């Protein structure tokens, strides 16, 4: 029936219905066809389909995290030794209810996380996430004053994409390069960052220059933010500053070339430590440091 | 130039070369004294009549002396010191033989504007003044240094090897108005014996002595008032090569705890050379003193180094015979004593 | 007779005739026509031509610095109250001798500043100065082992220009983005920089991301280098982190746009303080901290 093909069908779609929540919805559809009653026939084939999904992954982490939560919920269903049919019906229904929960959480956060942006504050935003931009839009809906500074992120020219999406709202902006980002931290009140993953330790899994932002802000004593939806938690512990799951290059040094083809290669995903984050915002209340780990301990029961 | 001309007339060149290579000569203070007596013998015995041929010969002798021993910076500096004293008096002499020469101050900028006598006697007296300077440094230190340390303050000390620093510490303890506790890091592979003699001389004078293992430095840094370095050689950028073992980590420990770092040195100890790499300048020790038995030493490749380097980021004051200076200024004190050409011999 | 036009004629030339040394040579040619015998007629017209040059300047600093040294040398000529003619002939001749001194200084530095690069050291190089690259080339001539990391500087795309000039030599390279530059400082031995100017205070006048490099290196305790030719000293004291002489934008925030045209605007030249520089290299010996100011005090006699 395929799961990778179902995820590939979301091209012109996206937004509101997030990338992990679309992968979880694809997991439920694959589950509900071939009988969820048998725990031997099904769970092994679910594990093989997740393994096939990881093998097809080029540069994504959150899909592996979203599978875990699904699994957990499935196992927790028949924890009460209930009817092997009513528990199954509740499991299949919690697929559309999972995607509906992405709406309710966004409704919660955009009313909680507007409080952090005070009267007339200049913001420097880096790493686009659906939660952080939803804060930015629903604060403009609240009729509050805020200035915005665009960071020139270089994965697939994300800065320009961010700049255009800010233009469609009615908030004054200008381009700032990630090289010169050090020269901005004095006229900026607060620095906001949207995450691709949050660590077991309390650190962050993010894009092509976020650790660099974290350190500079720690030097300038100016606050550093993480805002996300509560599903991007893996049991991952990057021990060092440059160690991450990759399908591509971990810093390659190429031979002598004249035609100029082999060059670009640099760490596209970078880690930052727990100390650099001043504040974290999710739908699971207002909490930052060890909170993430408590969540993970609460899930894994280990 | 070789030592073929100076063999029957000057014999003491080769005995100093022998004293360096086999390390019969010990301590920068002593190396300096020998090179002074070498240059004393060179001027007293030789016949030259010409000046520029003489100076360039001295340059080649100094070049060979530093190639013979790299850790003898005090050797290299003393020659460079007399070289500059010579060069000023020659430039003063050339102005009288030809016949404003006084713009404002004593600057640099040798890239801008272009250009029988008792000269030998001046060269003789120039050596004599250098000796007397090396003879008396402590008097010039004590008047600046014993102004900065307070009562009930705890002093941690790496490198107990320096004769200069111990004598600075004893003059302060002589003052009955000043009380201080002394912590001393052991410096296991080399300094041990010297550190134990250091602790003995402090008890001899009745100063609160505390012997510290090299592991326990962190376990005390919250309680430490000040840090003092017994340096061997000081550099352009500020940094120091010290008399062996367990300094660099202590300085790193101090900077993290924001504890002040002091350094006691001389201008002859001060060098106009630049430490571009520690890899070349630092001398390594003998691993024999660590671990016995040679059949396990096939698999036990042990690492030990004598001289330890400190980067300028840590220390704040270099109290000399002249005065106290900041590491961001010490280069000028150096250029006041040695010329720009007198570096690459 | 024009001086700005003479500087504009250097298009395909450069490299040998360094930007300030070509402006100084243009100053000497303008001096030698209308008689340097008079000090009222000539010096005032030289001052007017430098003022006309500053008014035509878009984003260059070093041309103002080079004028000062020329002036100084002219005044120092007849400081001995010498013949109003042999002093003049020495002044006119010190134009071609000034350009010849740029070669002699480069001969000095490339033998001095190869000592800093030790046995097998990975270097992260930022910016492009003729002194720093000449160290890199004449170390390869010395047959020494070194690796190179290219920073993606964004002025007129300098990283790509640097990468191509490294390919022509025979030294292995790879592209690193200035966003991710924080994630590199562990596999890098030393960080090098080429400056547009060196401050009176002891700080640096440089490109679109250099302060950011300086701070990160201060965090990682890894050394930070500045290598230049000794003519880029101005009596300039940038008091704050974001204050510099500019003809364009000092951070502009634009109105709501749909066509997407007004964006780029960010501080193209940034300052870094004295503390961040570990080492500085010029032909005027090996010196870093208070040295620059002492040079300026010696020159200006004030």
Name every chain C residue with its beta carbon within 8 A of the beta carbon of A160: 263
Residue B194 structure tokens: 């010297």
CA distance B332 to C295: 11
From C34's Cα to the closest Cα of chain B, the distance in A is 24
Question: Any long-range contacts for B212-218 (C-beta under 8 Å, 24+ apart)?
Answer: B212/B156, B212/B183, B212/B184, B212/B185, B212/B186, B213/B185, B213/B186, B214/B185, B214/B186, B214/B187, B214/B188, B214/B246, B214/B249, B217/B156, B217/B185, B217/B246, B217/B249, B217/B250, B217/B253, B218/B253
Paired sense of beta strands B308-310 and B240-242, if any:
antiparallel
* Backbone CA torsion sign across C47, C50, C55, C59: negative
- Residue C235, by phi and psi: left (phi above 0), alpha (psi -120 to 50) or beta? beta
Contacts of B210 (CB under 8 A, 6+ apart): B181, B182, B183, B184
Which H helix or E strand runs over B45? helix B28-45
Chains touching A by CB (3 or more pairs below 8 Å): C
Q: What are the structure tokens assigned to A85, written together?
A: 């049919």
Q: What's the token pair of residue B333?
A: 């004190």
Strands A270-272 and A204-206: antiparallel
Give C260's contacts in chain A (Cβ within 8 Å): 163-164, 167
User: How far apart are the C-alpha atoms of A52 and A63, rounded to whole Å?
Assistant: 12
State whether C177 and A182 contact (CB < 8 Å): no
> B120 with B80, same domain?
yes
CA C128 to chain centre: 9
Given CB atoms, is B95 within the 8 Å cutoff of chain C? no
**Dist. CA B58–CA B53, nearest whole Å:** 9
If DSSP codes are grouped into helix, strand and coil, which group holds residue B192? helix
Q: Which of C167, C176, C187 sits opposite A257 (nearest CB)?
A: C167
**211-250 in chain C: CB under 8 A from chain A:** 211-212, 215-216, 219, 240-242
C-alpha to C-alpha distance for B285 and B244, rounded to whole angstroms: 9
Contacts of C115 in chain B (CB under 8 A): 276-277
The CATH number given to whatever domain includes residue A238 is 3.40.50.10470
Please give the structure tokens belonging to residue C234.
């101005």
Query: Is residue C181 within 8 Å of C116, Cβ to Cβ?
Result: no
Which residues neighbour B228 within 8 Å (Cβ) at sequence distance 6 or greater?
B155, B156, B157, B165, B169, B261, B262, B263, B264
Distance, CA of C152 to CA of C159 (rounded, Å): 4
| CA-to-CA dists, residue B176 to B153, B173, B179, B205, angstroms | 15, 7, 7, 12
In contact, C159 and C175? CB cutoff 8 Å: yes
* Angle value at C-alpha A123, between A118 and A129, nearest 5 degrees: 105
Query: What residues have CB less than 8 Å from C3, skipping those under 6 apart?
Result: C23, C26, C27, C30, C49, C52, C53
DSSP secondary structure of B199-217 = HHHHHHTT--EEEE-TTTT
3-state secondary structure at position C290: coil
Cα A97 from chain centroid (whole Å): 20
Provide φ and ψ at B263, rounded to 5°: -140, 130
Closest CA to B229 of B160, B172, B322: B160
Claim to verify: residue B62 and residue B96 sit in the same structural domain: yes
CA–CA min distance C99, chain B (Å): 13
Angle at C127 between CA A217 and CA C254, to 5 degrees: 55
If you measure CA to CA, which chain A residue comes closest to C172? A255
Q: How many residues does chain B have?
A: 345
Query: Is B in contact with C (3 or more beta carbon pairs below 8 Å)?
Result: yes
SS3 for B78? helix
Burial class (CB in 10 A: 0-12, 13-18, 19+), C251: middle
* Residue spans of beta strands (DSSP E) within B113-206: 153-157, 180-185
3-state percent breakdown (helix, strand, coil) of chain A, nearest 5: 40, 15, 45
Residue C241 and residue C211 in contact, taking contact as beta carbons nearer than 8 Å: yes
Size of interface B-C (CB pairs under 8 A): 54
> How many Å is the Cα radius of gyration of chain C?
21
**Domain stop point among B79, B101, B135:** B135
Chain C CB contacts of B100 below 8 Å: 79-80
CA distance B277 to chain C (A): 6
Up-side HSE of residue B228: CA atoms within 13 Å toward CB? 28
List the domain range (segments joined by +) for residue C282.
103-299
Paired sense of beta strands C190-193 and C224-227, if any: parallel
Nearest to C113 by CA among C174, C187, C192: C192
One domain for residues B256 and B160: yes
In angstroms, rounded to a whole number, what is the distance separating the alpha carbons of residues C193 and C182? Answer: 16
Please tell me whether residues B88 and B193 are part of one structural domain. Answer: no
For testing the chain C interface, which of B99, B237, B343 should be mutated: the one with the most C CBs within 10 Å?
A: B237
Measured between CA atoms, how close is C287 to chain B, in angstroms?
Answer: 7
Residue B279 contacts C where some CB pair is shorter than 8 Å: yes
Tell me whether A189 touches chain C (CB under 8 Å): no
Task: Tell me the chain C residues in contact with residue B343 when contact means C-beta distances shorter than 8 Å.
Answer: 285
Residue after which a domain boundary falls, among B135, B170, B198: B135
Whether the CB of C256 is below 8 Å from some CB of chain A: the reply is: yes
For residue B142, the enclosing domain spans 137-336
| CA–CA separation, B121 and B114 (whole Å) | 29
CA distances from A139 to A112, A116, A283, B90, C110 (A): 11, 10, 17, 80, 58
Q: How many domains is chain B partitioned into structurally?
A: 2
Contact flag A212-C180 (C-beta cutoff 8 Å): yes
Q: Among residues B85, B120, B135, which one ends one of the domains?
A: B135
Helix (H) or strand (E) holding B241: strand B240-242
Rounded to a whole number, what is the distance in Å from the CA of C195 to chain B's nearest CA?
20
DSSP reduced 3-state for C80: helix
Q: Judge A/B contact: 3 or more CB pairs < 8 A.
A: no
B307 close to B232: Cβ distance less than 8 angstroms:
yes
Both B21 and B32 in one domain: the answer is yes
Contact B206, B230 (CB under 8 A): no
List of chain C residues whose C-beta atoms are within 8 Å of the C-beta of residue B332 = 290, 294
Name the residue of chain C whose CA is nearest to A267's CA. Answer: C180
CA nearest to B60, candidates B21, B6, B111, B128: B6
The packing angle between helices B192-204 and B163-174, to 10°, is 20
Probe site for chain C from B108, B110, B335 (most C CB atoms < 10 A): B108
Strand intervals (E) in chain C:
121-126, 146-152, 175-177, 190-193, 197-198, 204-206, 224-227, 270-272, 279-281
Q: Are C197 and C234 in contact (CB under 8 A)?
A: yes
- Whole-angstrom Cα distance, residue C136 to residue C146? 9
Return the exposure string of B208-227: e unless at least 16 CB atoms fall within 10 Å of the residue's CB, then b. ebeebebeebeebbeebbbb
C-alpha distances out from residue B311 to A75, B238, B247, C216, Å? 59, 8, 11, 18
How many other C-beta atoms can be found within 10 angstroms of the C-beta atom of residue C288?
23
- Asked whether A199 and A236 are in contact (CB, 8 A), the reply is yes
Query: How many other C-beta atoms are found inside a 10 Å radius of the C-beta of residue B291?
Result: 12
Same domain, B126 and B95: yes
| CA–CA separation, C207 and C157 (whole Å) | 11
Residue B176 buriedness (CB in 10 A; 0-12 / 13-18 / 19+): exposed
Helix axes B52-68, B73-98, angle to 10 degrees: 170
**What is the edge-to-edge ordering of all strands in the sheet holding A197-198?**
A197-198, A204-206, A270-272
Chain C residue with CA closest to A213: the answer is: C179
Q: Are residues B13 and B153 in the same domain?
A: no
Same domain assignment for residues B93 and B67: yes
**8 Å CB contact between A174 and C260:** no
Residues in chain C: 302
Chain C residues within an 8 Å CB radius of A240: 186
Contact, C16 vs C72, CB < 8 A? no
Task: Work out the burial of residue A5: count CB atoms within 10 Å of its CB; fewer than 13 is exposed, 13-18 middle, 19 or more buried.
Answer: exposed
State which H helix or E strand residue B233 sits in.
strand B231-234
Tokens of C233: 């000293």
In this structure, are residues B72 and B307 in contact, taking their beta carbons and an 8 Å threshold? no
C176: distance to nearest CA of chain A, Å? 5
Q: How far is CA B111 from CA A123, C100, C102, C232, in A?
A: 50, 12, 11, 15
- Closest approach of chain B CAs to the CA of C101, in angstroms? 9
Strands (E), chain A: 121-126, 146-152, 175-177, 190-193, 197-198, 204-206, 224-227, 270-272, 279-281
Residues of chain A with C-beta less than 8 angstroms from the C-beta of C178: 177-179, 209
Method: cryo-EM
Strand partners for A242: none
Backbone angles phi, psi at B272, to 5 degrees: -80, -5
Residue in this structure with the two tokens 């949207």, named with its chain if needed: A194
Q: How far apart are CA A51 and CA A5, in angstroms?
A: 15
Task: Measure C188 CA to nearest chain A CA, in Å.
Answer: 12
């Amino acid at each position: 029936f395929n799961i990778t093909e179902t995820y590939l069908r979301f091209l012109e779609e996206d937004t509101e219905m997030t990338m992990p929540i679309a992968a979880i919805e694809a997991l439920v559809t694959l589950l509900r066809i071939k009988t969820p009653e048998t725990a031997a026939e099904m769970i092994n084939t679910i594990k093989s389909s997740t393994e096939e999904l990881i093998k097809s992954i080029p540069n994504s982490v959150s899909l592996r995290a979203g599978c875990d939560i699904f699994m957990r919920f499935v196992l927790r269903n028949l924890h009460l030794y209930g009817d092997w049919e009513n528990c199954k019906q509740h499991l299949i229904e919690n697929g559309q209810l999972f995607v509906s929960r992405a709406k309710k959480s966004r409704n919660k956060i955009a009313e909680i996380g507007v409080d952090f942006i005070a009267d007339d504050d200049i913001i420097l935003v880096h790493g686009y996430s659906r939660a952080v931009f939803s804060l930015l839009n629903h604060a403009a809906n609240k009729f509050i004053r805020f200035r915005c500074v665009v960071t020139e992120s270089r994965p697939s020219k994300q800065g320009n994409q961010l700049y255009t999406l800010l233009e469609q709202k009615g908030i004054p902006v200008t381009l700032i390069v990630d090289s010169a980002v050090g020269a901005v931290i004095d006229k900026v009140d607060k620095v906001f960052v949207g995450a691709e993953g949050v660590a077991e330790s309390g650190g962050i899994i993010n894009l092509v220059g976020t650790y660099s932002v974290g350190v500079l802000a720690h030097n300038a004593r100016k606050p550093f933010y993480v805002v996300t939806e509560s599903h991007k938690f893996v049991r991952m512990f990057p021990l060092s500053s440059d160690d991450l799951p990759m399908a591509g290059p971990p810093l390659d040094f190429t031979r002598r070339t004249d035609d100029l083809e082999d060059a670009l290669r640099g760490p596209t995903i970078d880690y930052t430590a727990q100390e650099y984050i001043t504040a974290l915002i999710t739908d699971l209340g207002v909490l930052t440091p060890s909170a993430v780990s408590e969540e993970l301990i609460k899930m894994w029961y280990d | 130039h070789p030592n073929a001309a100076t063999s029957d007339v000057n014999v003491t060149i080769d005995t100093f070369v022998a004293k360096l290579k086999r390390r019969q000569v010990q301590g920068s203070y002593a190396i300096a004294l020998e090179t002074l007596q070498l240059l004393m013998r060179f001027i007293s015995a030789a016949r030259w009549n010409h000046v520029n041929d003489l100076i360039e010969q001295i340059r080649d002798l100094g070049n060979s002396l530093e190639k013979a021993h790299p850790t003898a910076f005090s050797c290299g500096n003393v020659i460079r010191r007399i070289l500059a004293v010579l060069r000023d008096e020659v430039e003063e002499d050339t102005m009288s033989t030809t016949v404003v020469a006084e713009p404002l101050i004593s600057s640099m900028f040798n890239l801008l504007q272009k250009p029988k006598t008792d000269y030998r006697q001046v060269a003789i007296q120039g050596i004599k003044d250098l000796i007397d300077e090396i003879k008396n440094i402590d008097e010039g230190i004590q008047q600046i240094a014993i102004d900065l340390i307070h009562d009930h303050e705890i002093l941690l000390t790496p490198t107990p090897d320096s004769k200069t620093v111990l004598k600075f510490l004893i003059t302060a303890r002589e003052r009955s108005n000043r009380t201080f506790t002394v912590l001393v890091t052991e410096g296991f592979p080399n300094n041990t014996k010297n550190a134990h003699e250091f602790a003995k001389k402090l008890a001899q004078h009745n100063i609160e002595t505390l012997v510290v293992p090299d592991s326990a430095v962190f376990a005390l840094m919250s309680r430490v008032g000040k840090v003092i370095i017994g340096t061997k050689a000081v550099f352009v950028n500020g940094g120091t090569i010290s008399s062996n073992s367990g300094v660099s980590s202590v300085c790193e420990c101090a900077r993290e705890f924001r504890t002040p770092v002091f350094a006691v040195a001389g201008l002859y100890k001060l060098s106009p050379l630049y430490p571009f790499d520690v890899e070349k300048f630092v001398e390594f020790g003998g691993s024999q003193r660590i671990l016995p038995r040679m059949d396990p030493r096939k698999r036990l490749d042990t690492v030990n180094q004598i001289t330890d380097y400190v980067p300028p980021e840590n220390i704040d004051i270099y109290i000399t015979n002249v005065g106290g200076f900041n590491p961001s200024f010490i280069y000028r004190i150096a250029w006041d004593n040695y010329k720009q050409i007198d570096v690459h011999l």
